[PDB]
Amino acid sequence: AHMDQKQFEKIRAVFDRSGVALTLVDMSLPEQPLVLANPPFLRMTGYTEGQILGFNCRFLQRGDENAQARADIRDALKLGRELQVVLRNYRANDEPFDNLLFLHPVGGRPDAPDYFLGSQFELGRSGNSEEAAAAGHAGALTGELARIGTVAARLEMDSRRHLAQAAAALVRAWERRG
Amino acid sequence: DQKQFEKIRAVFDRSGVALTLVDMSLPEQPLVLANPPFLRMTGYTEGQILGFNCRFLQRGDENAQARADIRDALKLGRELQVVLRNYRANDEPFDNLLFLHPVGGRPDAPDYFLGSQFELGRSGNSEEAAAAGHAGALTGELARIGTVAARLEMDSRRHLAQAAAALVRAWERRG
Ligand SMILES: Cc1cc2nc3c(=O)[nH]c(=O)nc-3n(C[C@H](O)[C@H](O)[C@H](O)COP(=O)(O)O)c2cc1C
Ligand SMILES: Cc1cc2nc3c(=O)[nH]c(=O)nc-3n(C[C@H](O)[C@H](O)[C@H](O)COP(=O)(O)O)c2cc1C
Secondary structure, three states, X not given: OOOOHHHHHHHHHHHHHOOOOOEEEEOOXXXXXXXXXXXXXXXXXXXXXXHHOOOOHHHHOOOOOOHHHHHHHHHHHHHOOOEEEEEEEEOOOOOEEEEEEEEEEEOOEOOEOOEEEEEEEEOXXXXXXXXXXXXXXXXXXXXXXXXXXXXXXHHHHHHHHHHHHHHHHHHHHHHOOO | OOHHHHHHHHHHHHOOOOOEEEEOOOOOOOEEEEOHHHHHHHOOOHHHHOOOOHHHXXXXXXXXXXXXXXXXXXXXXXOEEEEEEEEOOOOOEEEEEEEEEEEOOEOOEOOEEEEEEEEOOOOOOOHHHHHHHHHHHHHHHHHHHOOOOHHHHHHHXXXXXXXXXXXXXXXXXXX
């Protein structure tokens, strides 16, 4: 199955002007390479676009440190459905950070998406309002998803509500984790 | 301008948050745009409310201080978030977390005002999150209209999200 070149260009434009970190991965092959990565993602990770395209995003990890998170990721990718998970990640300078990662299938068939979209949230970060910030990120993300087409327009409010909820919950878990 | 307005219209039709636009150049400050999530929330039809001031959502006098803050922010061309008691077309009550943002014109005399309505009391015990969610979505739309500079989008999102959460917490501490 194939997405039109015009849709792919729409996704590009969405990425280029987005105010949230966004990545796009090719699901057509098992290596699952990065194919799009926008400035807010580049600036969080300290990389340049030319450095990372063609690589799997696991480059952000070190050793094996996110075992259960990674198994949940693999399932959601094979299934072709959304997932939010928290990961220990590292910038290009090896400084660590915790990544609230949002995953969404793009294109293809219901159980065989053409791409996967990733949006990263840094649990650095703000202060005592991490829940609000994460929920805000999720609302902005849902707006971008709806522009792409992966989230049905009529369901935007419903996705955001649940997405904002799922995000705040994860932030809570992460905060009682030490 | 002319283009920017049809740009605003485009943003309104596509958006997933309730959005209204009001003309400040006209004495009664009439609604000139009301998008589908707004109509779906309020149950009014475009025909009944275009050309009218958004105060129709109110009944009686329950929002005295909120109204005064609103009038102040309108005169000054300032952003504002406030909670109002409002009513759907079938009379039913709901609490409305209203976001207001100046659009166009002068920094102190905008051509239009944008409003975005977030219904409180639908989200169970996840109201803070739902409201921050709405704020994040709203900031996205503000950036596409061009009223929020593209580079400031993330910083204004985080702050709007926090201000929405604060207002929710207050609203939960009331009897
Ligand atoms: C669209 C997309 C974005 C991703 N973004 C990240 C990320 O930002 N940080 C990270 O550690 N892993 C990210 N991943 C996950 C890795 O690419 C990989 O799928 C994960 O580590 C699990 O697979 P593995 O156990 O084979 O490594 C992303 C995956 C996809 C599909
Ligand atoms: C863009 C915009 C959106 C507004 N939305 C609402 C609303 O959703 N609910 C409400 O009760 N008032 C809303 N208002 C406020 C009324 O239009 C009016 O400004 C307010 O009641 C204060 O003025 P007043 O005391 O003269 O009525 C909105 C105003 C503007 C400019």
